[PDB]
Design a protein around this nucleic acid. Structure first.
Ligand SMILES: Nc1ncnc2c1ncn2[C@@H]1O[C@H](COP(=O)(O)OP(=O)(O)OP(=O)(O)O)C[C@H]1O
Ligand SMILES: [Mg+2]
Ligand SMILES: [Zn+2]
Lengths: 99, 149, 125, 422, 298, 739, 99, 54
RNA sequence: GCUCGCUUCG
């Protein structure tokens, strides 16, 4: 898909057995790789590759506030019941910066 | 054909050298270059086409055929095998394309479109046949693949 | 055999030799004249309406130009299709209503084409 | 490129105008001629010219097969019938050449005899192409068919007297439908029968080697002086071009040539309607120098007015009495009044304010804009300026016209002050 | 991958010639198992891969050479005593192309499927002169059948395999050694393997039918696998070998290469309902009703 | 409606029955009049097109005709008798909308910017698309399925169209036609058409050594049989002739006659025989054989996609054919009624006036325009999709759909041979504008500056050609056709003759066309490969205006443009003064055109007026299109055909089944000159928004965009959807009504 | 997609709305980039469209300049309201009892 | 080569008479005996020695 | 409600 007007279909099974078979065999987490060559299809895409690339660049250096904000940006849903585990900073004597 | 290959080689030399020069002169933090390095979208070829120089327009893996008599367009001389008269695009997308270069680019785009249009139906029929033939096989419990019979 | 030209043709026909030659020239549909007392209308004026005597001059200019001055206008004469088959110009004279005479006048070898110089007729007026 | 040499004269001869034919053999090269071949006869028709030559060919020559000659002679004719035989002897001796008509009219074709310093032209009465006809094979097939019929009748040695009395099979002369009658008329058999209806004419052959050939060859010449001015052939190049090319039979619809074909008044009216602003010199240049200036002036005085030395088309010309504003739909009289007010403001001052005109004339913005665009241009910080500069030359040359236009503008100003209450 | 394949061009596989069908048409020709395919390619290995003379010799041995391609002039001479056709062989071009063809080999080439020319008609006068004197066959044929010979005398095969149309000398420029192989655009693998100087043990082909008929069903399966994998790699997309192995095994499990078309599917499958649903509904249904074939639900 | 209909009426002016002769029905003059409505009881009334849209009726005018006939052998004349109803195209000559001011358009509830040119039938707007087809009466050399390079010629006259082919399947040429049981050798046909000598046949084919070597087998096969005369060849042909399923009437030994009639009339209809003289037909088939022989060597196979061999049929020609068919059917029905009524009824003399049904032509026209399927049995033409519903999505949508062109291929399969963008489409058709999908490449749009030619009289063309030294083909043998300097001159597929020094002929013809003695749409081209001078004068050809360049300087100067701007001259004055001339594809194939002034060199004959005219109407909306990719331009055209915006000034009174309007439409800030030309800025179909190109919140990953809530709250993007709900209360046969 | 024409249109539209003009995007011509750059630099804006922008969420300036400008966006007839579809049991066909 | 009869223009074939081989036409008794040698070369194109690629 | 055609959509 490319989100330029694609119309997609959505079906609702009417049987518990069909629902369980769909969840098990056709689960999104259970079909992360194509059967053609085993390569993973469900992966990062545009605006996720560039964002992670700019994030992991050597020029990046974040203070405590920005790093804490970026880390907390993911603490939603099932991640609301886990500790943050703020990593120790790399540079600390001149300025405390998190890469 | 030897002359055609040599002219294509020279045009490709111009294209790749202009692309290398553009990539070397470009500074970091450039959004097209940044998106090309990480591979999210685009590549160095698209950057070279949109900045430095568009490549040779190739139809069916060859230069633009002579639609008219002994020439592609009446704007060029007869029996003229010059690069600009056969599909080469000296200007880039930034500087703007001449009417002949734009026409050749539209020809290439329409060729790609009709190729994809034929490919869709051809592969649909091939997939239908292959699935109708292969849908009977299944992996048994004795590690032996057996048919329905 | 190289393709000859009308100027050199006439030059070799008169300077190189003196023997007479039979030619077959194609005149335009309408000549630049009027049918003299032929009971009319701007109709076609062919050789059947003109009388005997001098009707025009043949000019050979430099660079190979061959023109035919038929009065106020000037046509141009070019070489026609180079025929190689036999062409016999004969005279079939039916002197009597029951018996006539066929007189072989000669042989036809070259063909000429006379055309109006439309460029001059246009730049004139 | 002057005519340096070869000033050859062209003479015309009418002695053999109706007796000159052109025979060309498409299958015989010019190298081999029929001068040595003894001819026997020539059939011909005056109307619907189609000549058939009947010549004789030798037999004792090594290039003739006597066995095949006997075979073809026995095939075409009977054993010893000889009542209607295509060959006198038992060998193929006579050859038939048939003519095909190239074109119906041959007036544009002429034979040219060249002599020292002169070229004599003679019209051609007809041109035919002579090709070797294959007519003996048709008679051979007919004779083979009759021999097959004879063999069928000869199945029995003695044939009883057949009671094959011809019962009266007189068919109805049915009234033929016009379509079927046209089909019968256009049929090839009908045309061939119509051609055969014309009787044949027999002619003897006189070869080039005969003295009669050189005797009659002089008829292609004409007795006349070397220099004679032809009474005809004196038409101008324009007349010749008209002869050889006979004719078939927004408001700017009419072109320049169609304009020039119209009377002078219509020309001036259409030009003033199209341009609406033009000097007098430009009008004289467009109409042509061959037209007198007084006539052009009188014509333009009826459809134009004088503004700052230039001529502007009248309001009623652009807007007829039955027309209306394309933008507002107001009657054409209001448009004429507004345009007259605009022209008066331009005569009074070169700069005209659009807002003042819109306020005085009480018209919409688009009508005032269309009125101004016809005769003015927008100058920043100055308003609307007349498109053409002050032409004082025409004013100095024609003071009486200036005074007439001045009193006309005085009357128009009086009318405008009465209407708009200026 | 068929949708992923772009159906590109210019992929001459390094020879800059010999246009070969690759992509979706190639996959279709492979899965259809047609007896005759478009642009068949045969790769032949040489015993002497380093010598170019031996390569050109075996090329001339395998490549079909017509009489007109080697003869410098063929003239129909009508002498006053008899009329005959004289063919002059260009021995210079023969030794240039290294063809083992002399006047006797040319004479033996004639009298083979040419209006039954008797051996006495063809004769040899010089070292490279062939004289052909045809005779009337009385079957609507006279001496003026000479022209007929002029139409097909240069089109007779004197050396090479008739099925072979064109063979080229491909070279591999490996840093260790540059070896020579034969690329044959023909449809006869047995003849190529049987020719002298060709290492038949390492000769492959693109036409699966020829491989099946010549080297068995397993060689056909291996050829199918290799060709499908090569065609897939040519477009940059990779497929696990197990899929193509399963496809080849399904195509080669009854002892004969059966295609994916309706005929091969009918020969493989037995279920009437599937045969009817795929193609030829009415025909298959009426045939089943005639045979009374009971169809299970397996 | 002004010329062609009168010619059709003249062609069928008199109709009579075979029974009871001296009776006839003679048409004198036919009129179409002004559009009216038959609502009033036996009274007509002027009706506007918008009223026809509202009332779900047709916008037509009564076709009447004045006639004279014989009732009881006494001549009775009618001066005004209606016979049908012709649907009136909008903005035509008889349409009420022409010659109207925008105020008068407002009075009639019609948009002044409406392009018009579409029919209104039963309330719906139908547009007849421009049909594209191959040119008729032209030799086409093409390869067959087995690779054999053969020839085909579709000789089409006003009555019959016959495609005859020639093959080389066995080294010899066979001629194939639908009227022959088996293809016969070409030499037998040569012998049947008058020329019996084989030497003349060979001279007509060609004198080249390879030509004789290729034609040898045909001569040998002909000599194998005993065919040596015209009668034998005609008998052999007649043996290969099959009757058209027991044609009514006694044959009476018509075999040779049927063969000669098929050779004269059925085979090569476009080549005319004066009186059973096949000389021109012999020369034509000899030239065809020579072309096949020359093409059998170097693969110079002609291509079908070359638009120089394409013809465009507008609504005029289609309506002319339809009206001719309907009038012939009406005349046949009248003749049948006469034959059935007159000979047995009574002493009360039968008159056609009591039987002239007026609903025939009306219903035929209405059905053909509405349903869109045209079935002409007289021409055996079964076409579909001729008319399409005019799309009222936006002004740009209708303006682009009005200039559409459909292909003869009539897409059902993957041809991928006409779908390519040929270089011949330069200046004529828009390269980028094409529907993205299955119809890619077969539905096209005309360029901004283009024109379609009409038919000419073809008389002065022949006269000028004969006066320019063109020798008659009947005067010389075919050997002259093999000379290198002799060039054949054609005329609409007919061999006009031969000529030498064709440069002078072409220059004189072009100068005469520029002078005005020859129609400016008559095209002349030269093919040096085949050595053929083609003179095209038929209609449907695409022509483009070009500025004439003489000696490295264009004829158009700054003074001429100043006079044009001031109003001294118009485009017709540029045409008459030999400044700008129309060039056809075949003619521009031989001409040298310069894009700009700086590109003009010594060998230049014409100058491009404006390069941006290459794009069409939809492509004109693209700002800076030369800086973008071609698929982007195609997608932009496709989406602009669906762009939402205002339709016209009468969009409020207009009631359609589906209408989309924009609340606050705004004209673009970056507008092309094409936008100003088509007046798109008066009816915009979009809004200018302050776009910032950046990544925000990851909700714009693939092609998505993030909108501002406050912007949408203040009216940005607000749209209106108008739907129609129609109901009918009709009276049935019984005296009861829906209430 | 290499849509440099979109960037050129944005720049020309920004220059036009700054100086009150209507720039032309004519094919094989139109207003050049140098003219709109001079128009931008004359009005006090950047000659490349990129402007200093502060993030609305965090209130801190962005590290990279944002490309702002007026673009002529057009809405299409394809709406989610008309394309949204949901099917209950509903009716069936008479011939084959299917939806 | 292709030869034609000067008499009627039909194609000439080669046959054997009573003394020598002669050209003859099938529709007329015209014949032509052969005196000296007659030849018609064609010079077919030589199979160009193909080169090794790679 | 059946059919067909056009049209779009990805
Ligand atoms: N006929 C069709 N068959 C199957 N899928 C189609 C068809 N038409 C469109 N699609 C859907 O739309 C997608 C085609 O988009 P794609 O061709 O990859 O980009 P695009 O249309 O070339 O866009 P650009 O022109 O590259 O901007 C893929 C497919 O799921
Ligand atoms: Mg999509
Ligand atoms: Zn003969």
């Amino acid at each position: 898909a490319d989100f330029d007007g694609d119309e997609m279909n959505l079906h609702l099974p009417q049987t518990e057995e069909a629902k369980a078979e769909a969840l098990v065999l056709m689960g999104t987490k259970a079909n992360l790789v194509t059967p053609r060559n085993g390569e993973p299809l469900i992966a990062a895409i545009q605006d996720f590759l560039t964002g992670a690339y700019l994030l992991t660049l050597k020029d990046t250096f974040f203070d405590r506030a920005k790093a804490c904000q970026i880390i907390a940006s993911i603490l939603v849903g099932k991640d609301e019941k886990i500790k943050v585990r703020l990593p120790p900073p790399t540079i600390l004597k001149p300025v405390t910066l998190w890469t | 054909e030897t002359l055609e290959a040599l002219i294509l080689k020279e045009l490709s030399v111009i294209r790749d050298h202009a692309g290398s020069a553009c990539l070397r002169e470009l500074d970091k933090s450039n959004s097209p270059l940044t998106m090309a390095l990480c591979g999210s979208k685009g590549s160095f070829i698209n950057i070279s086409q949109m900045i430095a120089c568009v490549g040779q327009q190739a139809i069916s893996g060859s230069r633009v055929p002579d639609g008219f008599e002994n020439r592609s367009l009446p704007h060029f001389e007869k029996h003229s095998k010059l690069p600009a008269a056969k599909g080469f695009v000296a200007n880039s997308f930034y500087s703007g394309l001449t009417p002949t270069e734009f026409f050749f680019h539209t020809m290439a785009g329409r060729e790609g479109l009709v190729d994809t249009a034929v490919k869709t139906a051809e592969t649909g029929y091939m997939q239908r046949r292959l699935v109708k033939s292969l849908e009977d096989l299944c992996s048994q419990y004795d590690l032996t693949v057996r048919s329905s019979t | 055999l190289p393709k000859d030209v009308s100027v050199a043709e006439l030059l070799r026909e008169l300077s190189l030799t003196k023997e007479e030659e039979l030619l077959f020239l194609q005149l335009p549909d309408t000549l630049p004249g009027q049918p003299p007392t032929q009971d009319i209308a701007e109709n076609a004026c062919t050789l059947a309406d003109l009388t005997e005597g001098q009707v025009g001059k043949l000019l050979i200019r430099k660079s190979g130009r061959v023109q035919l001055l038929l009065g106020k206008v000037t046509l141009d004469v070019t070489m026609g299709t180079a025929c190689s088959f036999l062409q016999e110009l004969v005279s079939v004279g039916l002197g009597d209503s029951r018996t006539g005479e066929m007189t072989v006048l000669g042989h036809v070898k070259h063909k000429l084409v006379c055309s109006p110089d439309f460029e001059s007729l246009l730049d004139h007026k | 490129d002057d005519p340096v040499v070869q000033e050859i004269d062209v003479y015309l001869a009418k002695s053999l105008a109706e007796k000159l034919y052109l025979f060309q053999y498409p299958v015989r090269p010019a190298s081999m001629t029929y001068d040595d071949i003894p001819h026997l006869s020539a059939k011909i028709k005056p109307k619907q010219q189609k000549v058939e030559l009947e010549m004789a060919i030798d037999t004792l020559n090594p290039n003739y097969c006597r066995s095949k000659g006997e075979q073809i002679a026995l095939n075409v004719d009977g054993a010893c019938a000889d009542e209607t035989s295509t060959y006198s002897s038992k060998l193929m001796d006579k050859q038939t050449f048939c003519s095909s008509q190239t074109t119906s009219n041959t007036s544009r074709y002429a034979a040219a005899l060249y002599r020292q310093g002169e070229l004599h032209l003679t019209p051609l009465h007809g041109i035919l192409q002579l090709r070797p006809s294959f007519s003996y094979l048709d008679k051979a097939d007919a004779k083979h068919r009759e021999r097959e019929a004879a063999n069928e009748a000869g199945d029995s040695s003695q044939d009883e007297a057949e009671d094959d009395v011809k019962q009266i099979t007189v068919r109805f002369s049915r009234p033929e439908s016009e379509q079927a009658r046209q089909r019968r008329v256009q049929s090839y058999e009908f045309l061939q029968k119509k051609h055969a209806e014309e009787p044949w004419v027999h002619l003897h052959y006189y070869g080039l080697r005969d003295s009669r050939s050189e005797h009659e060859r002089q008829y292609l010449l004409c007795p006349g002086s070397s220099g004679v001015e032809n009474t005809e052939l004196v038409k101008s190049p324009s007349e010749y071009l008209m002869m050889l090319m006979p004719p078939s039979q927004p408001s700017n619809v009419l072109s320049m040539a169609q304009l020039r074909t119209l009377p002078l008044a219509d020309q001036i009216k259409i030009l003033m309607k199209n341009v609406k602003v033009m000097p007098f010199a430009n009008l004289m240049s467009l109409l042509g120098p061959s037209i007198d200036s007084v006539a052009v002036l009188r014509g333009i005085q009826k459809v134009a007015m004088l503004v700052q030395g230039n001529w502007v088309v009248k309001s009623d010309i652009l807007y007829p009495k039955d027309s209306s504003s394309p933008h507002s739909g107001v009657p054409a009289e209001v448009l004429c009044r507004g345009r007259d007010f605009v022209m008066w403001k331009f005569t009074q001052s070169r700069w005209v304010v659009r807002k003042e005109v819109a306020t005085v004339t009480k018209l919409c913005a688009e009508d005032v804009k269309d009125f101004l665009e016809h005769m003015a241009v927008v100058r920043i910080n100055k308003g609307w300026e007349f498109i053409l500069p002050y032409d004082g030359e025409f004013i100095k040359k024609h003071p009486d016209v200036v005074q007439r236009q001045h009193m006309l503008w005085t009357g128009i100003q009086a009318k405008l002050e009465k209407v708009y209450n200026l | 991958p068929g949708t992923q394949m772009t159906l590109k061009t210019f992929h001459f596989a390094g020879v800059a010639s010999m246009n070969i069908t690759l992509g979706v048409p190639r996959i279709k020709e492979i899965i259809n198992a047609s007896k005759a395919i478009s642009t068949p390619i045969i790769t032949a290995q040489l015993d002497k891969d380093d010598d170019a003379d031996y390569a050109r010799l075996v090329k001339g041995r395998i490549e079909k050479t017509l009489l007109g391609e080697i003869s410098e002039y063929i003239e129909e001479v009508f002498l006053p005593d008899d009329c005959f056709i004289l063919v002059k062989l260009s021995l210079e071009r023969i030794r240039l192309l290294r063809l083992e063809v002399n006047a006797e080999t040319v004479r033996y080439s004639i009298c083979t499927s040419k209006l039954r020319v008797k051996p006495g008609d063809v004769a040899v006068h010089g070292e490279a002169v062939v004289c052909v004197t045809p005779r009337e066959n009385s079957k609507s044929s006279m001496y003026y059948v000479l022209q007929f010979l002029k139409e097909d005398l240069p089109k007779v095969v004197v050396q090479g395999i008739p099925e072979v149309s064109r063979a080229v000398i491909h070279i591999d420029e490996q840093s260790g050694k540059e070896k020579y192989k034969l690329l044959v655009e023909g449809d006869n693998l047995r003849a190529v393997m049987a020719t002298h100087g060709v290492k038949g043990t390492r000769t492959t082909s693109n036409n699966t039918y020829e491989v099946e008929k010549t080297l068995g069903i397993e060689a056909a399966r291996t050829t199918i696998i290799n060709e499908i994998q090569y065609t897939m790699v040519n477009h940059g997309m990779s497929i696990d070998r197990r899929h193509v192995m399963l496809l080849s095994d399904l195509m080669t499990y009854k002892g004969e290469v059966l295609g994916i078309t309706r005929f091969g599917l009918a020969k493989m499958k037995e279920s009437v309902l599937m045969l009817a649903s795929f193609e030829k509904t009415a025909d298959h249904l009426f045939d089943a009703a005639y045979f009374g074939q009971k169809d299970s639900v397996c | 409606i002004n010329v062609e209909i009168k010619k059709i009426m003249k062609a069928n002016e008199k109709v009579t029955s075979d029974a009871d002769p001296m009776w006839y029905l003679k048409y004198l003059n036919i009129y179409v009049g002004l559009p009216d409505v038959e609502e009033s009881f036996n009274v007509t009334r002027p009706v506007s097109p918008h009223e026809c849209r509202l009332r779900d009726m047709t916008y037509s005018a009564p076709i009447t005709v004045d006639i004279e006939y014989t009732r009881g052998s006494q001549r009775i004349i009618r001066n005004a008798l209606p016979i049908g109803r012709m649907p009136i195209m909008l903005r035509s000559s008889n349409c009420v909308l022409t010659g109207k001011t925008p105020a008068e358009f407002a009075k009639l509830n019609e948009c002044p910017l409406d392009p018009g040119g579409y029919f209104i039938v039963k309330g719906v707007e139908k547009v007849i698309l421009i049909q594209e087809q191959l040119s008729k009466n032209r030799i086409i050399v093409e390869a067959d399925r087995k690779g054999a390079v053969g020839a085909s010629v579709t000789s089409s006259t006003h009555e019959k169209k016959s495609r005859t082919n020639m093959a080389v399947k066995q080294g010899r040429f066979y001629l194939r036609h639908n009227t022959l049981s088996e293809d016969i050798p070409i030499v037998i046909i040569f012998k049947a058409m008058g020329v019996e000598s084989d030497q003349e046949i060979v001279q007509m084919i060609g004198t080249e050594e390879h030509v004789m070597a290729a034609f040898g087998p045909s001569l040998e096969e002909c000599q194998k049989a005993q065919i040596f005369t015209q009668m034998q060849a005609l008998k052999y042909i007649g043996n290969k002739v099959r009757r058209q399923r027991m044609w009514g009437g006694g044959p009476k030994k018509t075999k040779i006659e049927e063969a000669r009639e098929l050779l004269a009339s059925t085979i090569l209809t476009h080549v005319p025989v004066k009186e059973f003289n096949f000389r021109a037909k012999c020369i034509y088939t000899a030239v065809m054989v020579r072309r096949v022989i020359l093409a059998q060597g170097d693969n110079k196979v002609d291509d079908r996609d070359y638009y120089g061999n394409k013809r465009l049929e507008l609504a005029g020609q289609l309506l002319s054919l339809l009206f001719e068919d309907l009038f012939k059917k009406f005349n046949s029905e009248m003749k049948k009624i006469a034959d059935q009524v007159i000979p047995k009824q009574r002493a009360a003399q039968f008159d056609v006036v009591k039987h002239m049904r007026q609903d025939q032509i009306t219903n035929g026209m209405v059905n053909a325009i509405s349903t869109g399927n045209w079935s002409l049995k007289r021409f055996k033409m079964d076409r579909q999709g001729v008319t399409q519903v005019l799309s009222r999505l936006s002004y740009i949508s209708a303006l682009g759909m009005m200039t559409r062109i459909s292909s003869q291929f009539e897409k059902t399969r993957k041809v991928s041979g006409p779908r390519s963008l040929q270089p011949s489409q330069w200046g004529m058709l828009c390269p980028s504008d094409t529907p993205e999908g299955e119809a890619c490449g077969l539905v096209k749009n005309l360029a901004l500056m283009t024109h379609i030619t009409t038919d000419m009289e073809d008389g002065p063309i022949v006269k000028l050609a004969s006066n320019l030294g063109v020798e008659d083909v009947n005067l010389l043998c075919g050997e002259e056709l093999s000379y290198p300097n002799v060039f054949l001159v054609f005329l609409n597929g007919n061999i006009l003759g031969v000529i030498r020094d064709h440069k002078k002929l072409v220059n004189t013809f072009r100068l005469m066309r520029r002078a005005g003695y020859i129609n400016e749409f008559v095209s002349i081209s030269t093919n040096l490969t085949d050595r053929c001078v083609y003179i095209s004068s038929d209609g449907g050809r695409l022509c483009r205006p070009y500025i004439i360049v003489k000696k490295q300087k264009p004829a158009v100067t700054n003074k001429h443009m100043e006079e044009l701007a001031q109003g001294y001259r118009n485009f017709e004055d540029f045409l008459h003064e030999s400044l700008v001339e129309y060039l056809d594809v075949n003619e521009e194939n031989d001409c040298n055109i310069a894009l700009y002034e700086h590109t003009i060199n010594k060998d230049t004959t014409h100058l491009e007026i404006e390069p941006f005219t290459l794009l069409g109407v939809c492509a004109g909306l693209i700002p800076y299109p030369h800086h973008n990719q071609s698929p982007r331009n195609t997608y932009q055209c496709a989406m602009g055909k669906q762009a939402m915006g205002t339709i016209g000034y009468n969009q409020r009174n207009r009631i359609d089944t589906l209408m989309y309007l924009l609340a606050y439409p705004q004209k673009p800030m970056v507008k092309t000159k094409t936008i100003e030309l088509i007046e798109f800025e008066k009816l915009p179909a979009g809004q200018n928004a302050t776009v910032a190109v950046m990544s925000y919140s990851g909700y714009d990953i693939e092609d998505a965009l993030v909108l501002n809530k406050a912007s949408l709250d203040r009216g940005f993007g607000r749209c209106l959807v108008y739907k129609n709900a129609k109901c009918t209360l009709k009276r049935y046969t019984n005296q009861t009504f829906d209430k | 997609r290499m849509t440099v024409g979109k960037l050129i249109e944005l720049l020309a539209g920004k220059a036009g709305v700054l100086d009150g003009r209507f720039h032309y995007g004519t094919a094989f011509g139109g207003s050049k980039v140098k003219d709109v750059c001079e128009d931008l630099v004359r009005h006090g804006y950047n000659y490349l469209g990129k402007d200093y922008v502060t993030s609305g969420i965090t209130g801190e300036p962005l590290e990279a300049y944002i490309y702002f400008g007026p673009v002529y966006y057009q809405k299409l007839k394809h709406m989610v309201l008309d394309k949204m579809h949901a099917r209950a049991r509903g009716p069936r066909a008479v011939l084959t009892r299917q939806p | 080569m292709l030869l034609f009869c000067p008499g009627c223009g039909n194609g000439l074939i080669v046959e054997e008479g009573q003394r020598c081989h002669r050209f003859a036409c099938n529709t007329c008794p015209y014949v032509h005996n052969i005196t000296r040698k007659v030849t018609n070369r064609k010079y077919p194109k030589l199979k160009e020695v193909d080169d090794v690629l790679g």
